[PDB]
Design a protein around this ligand. Sequence first.
Ligand SMILES: [Mg+2]
Ligand SMILES: [Mg+2]
Ligand SMILES: [Mg+2]
Ligand SMILES: [Mg+2]
Ligand SMILES: [Mg+2]
Ligand SMILES: [Mg+2]
Ligand SMILES: [Mg+2]
Ligand SMILES: [Mg+2]
Ligand SMILES: [Mg+2]
Ligand SMILES: [Mg+2]
Ligand SMILES: [Mg+2]
Ligand SMILES: [Mg+2]
Ligand SMILES: [Mg+2]
Ligand SMILES: [Mg+2]
Ligand SMILES: [Mg+2]
Ligand SMILES: [Mg+2]
Ligand SMILES: [Mg+2]
Ligand SMILES: [Mg+2]
Ligand SMILES: [Mg+2]
Ligand SMILES: [Mg+2]
Ligand SMILES: [Mg+2]
Ligand SMILES: [Mg+2]
Ligand SMILES: [Mg+2]
Ligand SMILES: [Mg+2]
Ligand SMILES: [Mg+2]
Ligand SMILES: [Mg+2]
Ligand SMILES: [Zn+2]
Ligand SMILES: [Zn+2]
Lengths: 214, 91, 127, 25, 202, 97, 97
Amino acid sequence: VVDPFTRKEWFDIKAPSTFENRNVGKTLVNKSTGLKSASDALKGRVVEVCLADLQGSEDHSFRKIKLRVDEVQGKNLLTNFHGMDFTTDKLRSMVRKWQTLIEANVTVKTSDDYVLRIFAIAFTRKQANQVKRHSYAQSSHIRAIRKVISEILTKEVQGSTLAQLTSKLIPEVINKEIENATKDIFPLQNIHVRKVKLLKQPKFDVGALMALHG
Amino acid sequence: AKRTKKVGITGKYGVRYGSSLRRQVKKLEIQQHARYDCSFCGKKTVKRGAAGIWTCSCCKKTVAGGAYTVSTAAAATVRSTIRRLREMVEA
Amino acid sequence: SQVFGVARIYASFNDTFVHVTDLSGKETIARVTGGMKVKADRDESSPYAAMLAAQDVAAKCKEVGITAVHVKIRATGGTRTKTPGPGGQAALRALARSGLRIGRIEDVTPVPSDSTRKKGGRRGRRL
Amino acid sequence: MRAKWRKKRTRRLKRKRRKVRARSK
Amino acid sequence: SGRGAPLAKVVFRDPYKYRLREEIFIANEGVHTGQFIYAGKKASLNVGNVLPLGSVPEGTIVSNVEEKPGDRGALARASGNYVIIIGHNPDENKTRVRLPSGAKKVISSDARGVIGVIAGGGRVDKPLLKAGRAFHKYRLKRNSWPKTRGVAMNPVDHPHGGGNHQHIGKASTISRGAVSGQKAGLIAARRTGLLRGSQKTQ
Amino acid sequence: SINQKLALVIKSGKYTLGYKSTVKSLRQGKSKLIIIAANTPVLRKSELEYYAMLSKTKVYYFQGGNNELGTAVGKLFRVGVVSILEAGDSDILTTLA
Amino acid sequence: PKKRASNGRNKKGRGHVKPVRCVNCSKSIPKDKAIKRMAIRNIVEAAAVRDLSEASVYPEYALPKTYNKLHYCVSCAIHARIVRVRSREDRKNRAPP
RNA sequence: GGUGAAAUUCUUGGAUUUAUUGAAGACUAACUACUGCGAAAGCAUUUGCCAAGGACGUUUUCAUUAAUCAAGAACGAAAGUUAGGGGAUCGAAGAUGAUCAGAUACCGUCGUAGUCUUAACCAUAAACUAUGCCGACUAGGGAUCGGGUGGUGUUUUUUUAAUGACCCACUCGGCACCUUACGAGAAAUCAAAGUCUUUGGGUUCUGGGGGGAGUAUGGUCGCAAGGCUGAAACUUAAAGGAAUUG
Ligand SMILES: [Mg+2]
Ligand SMILES: [Mg+2]
Ligand SMILES: [Mg+2]
Ligand SMILES: [Mg+2]
Ligand SMILES: [Mg+2]
Ligand SMILES: [Mg+2]
Ligand SMILES: [Mg+2]
Ligand SMILES: [Mg+2]
Ligand SMILES: [Mg+2]
Ligand SMILES: [Mg+2]
Ligand SMILES: [Mg+2]
Ligand SMILES: [Mg+2]
Ligand SMILES: [Mg+2]
Ligand SMILES: [Mg+2]
Ligand SMILES: [Mg+2]
Ligand SMILES: [Mg+2]
Ligand SMILES: [Mg+2]
Ligand SMILES: [Mg+2]
Ligand SMILES: [Mg+2]
Ligand SMILES: [Mg+2]
Ligand SMILES: [Mg+2]
Ligand SMILES: [Mg+2]
Ligand SMILES: [Mg+2]
Ligand SMILES: [Mg+2]
Ligand SMILES: [Mg+2]
Ligand SMILES: [Mg+2]
Ligand SMILES: [Zn+2]
Ligand SMILES: [Zn+2]
């Protein structure tokens, strides 16, 4: 029996800062030979840690999150951001029949020379004195609302660093910086940002990325 | 009076070579003969010769073109996507 | 509290799939669930057999050593059933009951925005 | 026989007798 | 004469002598008299210029492409043709491109090309529609026309020669290993018959 | 748009169409603004721009060829340049243009 | 004669409703006319939802389910799912239960 | 892998599965409803541009300019035809694996055309509400879409308004649904299919037992497939509709 079980050795993430917990747990890639073994074939993965998995209590527990393996050294392995998402359960539970969905996105930049496509998702609240059973806006609202969410996303992403960005939307109050504009248009319950993702970077800049650890 | 119900310019070929060949010639014939509009001076004065050579009657300017039109679809859809790729290299 | 993986379960009609691996995904550890201890090939999706080979799945899971993972379970989906299959749940039944540790769970079934027209044409399968 | 099949039946029938006397056209 | 594409006579200064030097280019569609042509590595992505395939982003359209740096143009020269660039491997500094045939060749990123597509496209969509129009076509290329069917000749003149009826009398597909005087018909044909089905390179 | 502000001074004020009359306008100072079709050649353009600089006249570049700028001013012929001599009541001499 | 003023379903005043394709046989069916049922079933089973929680971490944190809307074709809708053929005046009752 | 079950099939080429990732074409899910818009066909991601429209509001303007319409014309699902592009999906043909007594099929597989787009054709659908358009009158009821009016109505609290969303009442015009039947109908049912033997508001169109047959013939349109127009000889006592009982 070739029994490869004995063969290889685990390695480790921990999270960058802008969080509180960071210990990821462990991986298994290969022994580090040289004739092709891990220096180069590292930093090419992601993992799926929930957020209440990562910071706290479950007031924070729906967001999926990607994390891109960045670089490795001795007992290093360290993973920066790659994007984020919601989770099937709540989105399928927030899309109730008899109300209006509203979804929009924009591709915008941060001082960290990452462009990216944000998303946003909002729904209708029925004024809680009200008899009519469907609670629909009237597309004077839908257009003006997505006009104003689009006003706001860019002025926080162009607002600052992808790192400060993470620190901006973790506390989530962007969600109701939306409701700030919206309260003068429509009741608009359940307002979340509901994904984030891009593909292009500035070439690695090793020394920038170690500024999230201590 | 109208002189031919369908042959148009292609009547020179009389009855020969078959309707299909004549019709498909007529199309490119009309293309390669008609006067086009000049991009540099704004009159319809650019006519063909030596297919892919289109020249403006006044202002004496000549432009490489399609064999029977000034701009071929392909060319134009290149021009577009050469602009696109260009604008992507200054900002 | 302990060491983690990913679950990677998949249910069809007439087969089922279950496989551990690194949370990174790249390196896979053991999967074979399928038609393995079943063989009549009617019984490929059967829950009895999904269990019977889920056992030998959890087996190698701890045979190389891991305590816990959460699911990535999914029906075929695409432009096909998109609803779970028989031997999807009757396996993790006998893999949570196999004394292993389970967590943050979610479906990963592919769903489109309404395209890539299904097989069978506008009259469907006809029986 | 079905109505549209009776249609195809005679569309074909006519195509054929159209042919048969273009032979003497 | 004998070409479909028009040519562009393009005048430049001699860097090393008070002199003009007049090169001869193939005119890419849309070039014009009096236009300004820019040539070299640090040149701009304007249809008409000539830039190394290093300096251009994938999806660029170029013509008169070099197979080796500095051979002064080999690829995509017939009226209406071009090659697309489909990616760069900078470590070896190659560039992979797709030629008019469909085949995808890789060549150095120093090889040059001309932004755009060659002029006179669509020439072939017009029927020639008489024998004389072909006669005048080939008057100015070579003595290749007309063509006598080998199967109308006596056997002394051709493998398909002779017979009391006109037939090739043996498989028309000929081995690549065949000898001069044998190779007539479908040489080394990997298949034969009316091509049915999408033919675009998978 | 701006085509409407210009199409007011046709019915309102004093203008001159054509490369020659408008450069007599430019050297006699009577021009407040000159408008230049897109397709008008760069040499002419730079020349006018010089004359403008010396009359202290402003210039607007009409996005649109001389065909468009001719139909713009209600004439049925090409127009390579316009030169307004009195903006009868258009604010075109005080719009952002 | 007719057997429903509704004759197919729930369409008066559009002339066309792009169709859906059935979950069982894949047969297309106009959206207004497909019977719809939202299938909420959780991750769970009867005896299976105790011990997945016993030898477990996160001590029953979430418990989510599978949300997917279902469309049938009526003939397949008739085959198994809720058609349960009604009777002339009983079929006019649109109460779900 | 696929199904009721199988098999054709794919697997030293690491298949099915995973991960990162890229290309191409198509579609717009969930929100989606007895909900909107358009002459109909039809129309569902975003944004910008381009022109267009009904309802409302109106102590604005003109002042009979209108209704309906042979001829004639604009548009016209799907498929189908011509020339390019495209060709991912699914997929007439054809070839196959199975089933069957047979199985040219239904189920499975491969997959040509097609499916998509441009320029031009073609002009047909159970193109349906199997229900012409304009006008008038006859009957109750609560939903809802759009506009409007009314307010010491609720909520936003900022400091209360302004607003915005919401509640209630009314009134125009929508898409429907409900209950009744004065009334109508051969009935099924119908606020029109009502205001007809107490038979007449204006106007367009079609039908006159069933087959023969939308066949033959001519004319005309079309590249073609075919579209529009469209008989007769002869044959036959029924054919049909709605409802009842079996
Ligand atoms: Mg059946
Ligand atoms: Mg004959
Ligand atoms: Mg010769
Ligand atoms: Mg030959
Ligand atoms: Mg010959
Ligand atoms: Mg001879
Ligand atoms: Mg011989
Ligand atoms: Mg021989
Ligand atoms: Mg011979
Ligand atoms: Mg022969
Ligand atoms: Mg019936
Ligand atoms: Mg319908
Ligand atoms: Mg219809
Ligand atoms: Mg959508
Ligand atoms: Mg007449
Ligand atoms: Mg295809
Ligand atoms: Mg067949
Ligand atoms: Mg057989
Ligand atoms: Mg057959
Ligand atoms: Mg009809
Ligand atoms: Mg209908
Ligand atoms: Mg009605
Ligand atoms: Mg009819
Ligand atoms: Mg009423
Ligand atoms: Mg009665
Ligand atoms: Mg006829
Ligand atoms: Zn000119
Ligand atoms: Zn079905």
